[PDB]
């Protein structure tokens, strides 16, 4: 069990046919709280692949650094004076997913991996977070 999280990510839900590409837009509800940075890694159920992570975090109008080799992304979400930003309702992350044409009918998850850090300030303090949805239904299981 975990308490009601400070910040909630929503990966969305999707339906696809085997062979299709899926754009996964992740939004965030910070409950009107400002966030200074994020540092995360993603994960996805085999045999689906995250092919690319967009370098824009539209929710913060900021640029993310990425490393597809670890499905990682991070950014600092500060205004031009250094103050942490409250995200908009736009996607915080965009993932470009391939559903191979060999994929069996089923429901496949996309979400975070073993690291998802949402920072409050400049001192290592972090919000609690959770993620919802991220179900990709492939065919008619």
């Amino acid at each position: 069990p975990v308490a009601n999280a400070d910040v909630i990510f929503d990966f969305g839900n999707y339906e696809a046919k085997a062979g299709e590409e899926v754009q996964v837009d992740v939004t965030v509800d910070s409950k009107n709280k400002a966030i200074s940075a994020m540092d995360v890694v993603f994960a996805i159920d085999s045999p689906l692949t995250i092919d690319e992570i967009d370098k824009e975090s539209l929710a913060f109008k900021t640029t993310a650094m990425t490393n597809i080799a670890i499905l990682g992304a991070n950014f600092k979400s500060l205004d031009d004076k250094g103050e942490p930003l409250v995200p908009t309702k736009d996607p915080v992350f965009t993932l470009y997913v391939t559903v191979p044409a060999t994929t069996p009918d089923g429901v496949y998850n996309v979400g975070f991996g073993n690291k998802c850090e949402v920072h409050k300030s400049n001192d290592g303090s972090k919000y609690s977070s959770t993620a919802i949805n991220g179900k990709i239904k492939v065919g008619n299981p």
Partner: protein, 79 residues
Amino acid sequence: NVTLWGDANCDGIVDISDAVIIMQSLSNPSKFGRNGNDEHHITAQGELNGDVNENGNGITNADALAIQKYLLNLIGNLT
């Protein structure tokens, strides 16, 4: 003397908050720089620890980017 490479906020770990404090010091030095008025301004020790890119040139945007690269395993260490 550096206590921990990348530890710009002197909390004993290297994480994305270290990139934040560098960016804040650069964006608003009167608030967040070495002589800043905010309680969480960067410290002298933090500026030494944070000088991970081109060590010797002090704190620039590229120091924050280097911390991000390290966190992403794009580079193996800091410096």
